[PDB]
Amino acid sequence: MKDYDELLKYYELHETIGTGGFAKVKLACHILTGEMVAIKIMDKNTDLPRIKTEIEALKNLRHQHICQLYHVLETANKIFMVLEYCPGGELFDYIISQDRLSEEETRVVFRQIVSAVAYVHSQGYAHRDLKPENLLFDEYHKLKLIDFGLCACCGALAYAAPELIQGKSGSEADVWSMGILLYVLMCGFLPFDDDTAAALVAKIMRGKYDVPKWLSPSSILLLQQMLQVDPKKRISMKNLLNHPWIMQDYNYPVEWQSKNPFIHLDDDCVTELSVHHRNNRQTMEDLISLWQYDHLTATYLLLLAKKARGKPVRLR
Numbered sequence: 001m002k003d004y005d006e007l008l009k010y011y012e013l014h015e016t017i018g019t020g021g022f023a024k025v026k027l028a029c030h031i032l033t034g035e036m037v038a039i040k041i042m043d044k045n046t047d048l049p050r051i052k053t054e055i056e057a058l059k060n061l062r063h064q065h066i067c068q069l070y071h072v073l074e075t076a077n078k079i080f081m082v083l084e085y086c087p088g089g090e091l092f093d094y095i096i097s098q099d100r101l102s103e104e105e106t107r108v109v110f111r112q113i114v115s116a117v118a119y120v121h122s123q124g125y126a127h128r129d130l131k132p133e134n135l136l137f138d139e140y141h142k143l144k145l146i147d148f149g150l151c152a153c154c155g156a157l158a159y160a161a162p163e164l165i166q167g168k169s170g171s172e173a174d175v176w177s178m179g180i181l182l183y184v185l186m187c188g189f190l191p192f193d194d195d196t197a198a199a200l201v202a203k204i205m206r207g208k209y210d211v212p213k214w215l216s217p218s219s220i221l222l223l224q225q226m227l228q229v230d231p232k233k234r235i236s237m238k239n240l241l242n243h244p245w246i247m248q249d250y251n252y253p254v255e256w257q258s259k260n261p262f263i264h265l266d267d268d269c270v271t272e273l274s275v276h277h278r279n280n281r282q283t284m285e286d287l288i289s290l291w292q293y294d295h296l297t298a299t300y301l302l303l304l305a306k307k308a309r310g311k312p313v314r315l316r
C-alpha cells in the first residue's frame with residue numbers, strides 16, 4: 001500500500017511472524033546499519049490506548065533485559081513500532097518443549113527476570129502482565145521483556161496477585177507474578193489452575209498450592225516468600241536481589257542497573273553519524289540527545305548494537 005512508503009525509505013521488509021490482529025509482526029532489515037529488526041504493524045482504523053501506554057513506557061525505559069524500541073513511524077492509517085530482534089522465541093514455548101527446568105537452569109533465567117523488573121520499578125513503572133509469553137530470547141540466549149500494554153490493571157488471571165483481583169492495588173503484584181513464573185519453570189505447570197474463572201479466583205485467594213517432590217527446600221522457602229496472599233508479607237525487591245537462592249551458584253546479587261544509557265553518547269557512533277549526515281559533533285551530540293524515536297534514534301542505537309557484536313562501525 002501507500003502506508004509503507006515512509007517505512008520502505010528506512011527498512012527492507014522480510015518474513016511475517018505475526019498473523020492475527022494488529023499484534024501482527026513482520027521481520028525487517030535496517031537499510032543503513034544492516035542490522036536485523038522486528039516491526040510491529042498497528043492500524044489505528046480497526047486497543048490503541050495499550051499502544052500509547054507501551055510506546056510512552058518504552059521511550060523512557062532502557063535496559064539490557066528490556067526489548068528495545070528504536071523507531072516510531074506514524075502514517076495516517078498505521079502506527080509502526082521498530083523493536084529489537086529476539087529470534088530465540090518465547091520463554092513459554094521454551095518451557096512446554098523441555099518439560100520443566102532444573103533449579104540450576106531456572107536461576108540463570110530468573111536472575112534476568114529479577115534484573116528487568118527491579119529496573120522497571122526503579123523507573124516508577126509496574127509491568128502488570130508478567131508471564132512466560134511476555135519474555136523472549138535474543139540470539140545470545142538472553143531474555144528480553146515485552147508487552148507494556150499495562151503500566152504505572154489486570155493481565156492474565158493465572159499470574160494475577162490476590163489484591164489485584166479484589167481491586168486493592170502496585171509493584172507487589174509483579175513480585176507475586178514472578179513467584180508464579182518461578183513455580184512454572186521448576187514444575188512445568190501452574191500452581192493455581194482450573195476450568196472456570198470463578199474457580200481460579202477462589203484458588204488464588206486461599207493461596208494453597210501443591211509442592212512437587214522434586215523441589216528443593218531452598219526453592220520451597222523462596223516460593224512461600226514470593227507467594228504470600230498478604231502483599232505486606234510479600235518479599236521486597238531489595239531482599240529479592242540478594243536472596244540466598246538467587247545467590248546459590250553466583251556469589252554476588254542481581255546486577256539490576258541499566259548498562260544502556262540515555263545521557264551518554266558513544267564517540268565511535270556520534271562521529272560515524274557525522275560523516276553521513278554531513279555535519280560535526282556538538283551539533284550531532286545534541287541532535288542524538290533529542291531522543292525523538294525517529295530514523296536518527298534507530299540508526300544510533302543499531303550502530304551501538306553493531307559495535308557490541310564485534311563488527312566494524314559503519315553505515316552504508
Ligand SMILES: [NH3+]CCCOc1cc(-c2cn[nH]c2)ccc1C(=O)Nc1ccccc1
Pocket residue numbers: 017018023024025027037038040067083084085086087088089146147148
Ligand atoms: N506480538 C508478538 C510478536 C513477537 O515478536 C516481537 C514482539 C515484540 C514486542 C511486542 N510488543 N512489545 C514488544 C518485540 C520483538 C519481537 C521479535 O523480535 N520477535 C521475533 C523476531 C524474529 C524471530 C522470532 C521472533
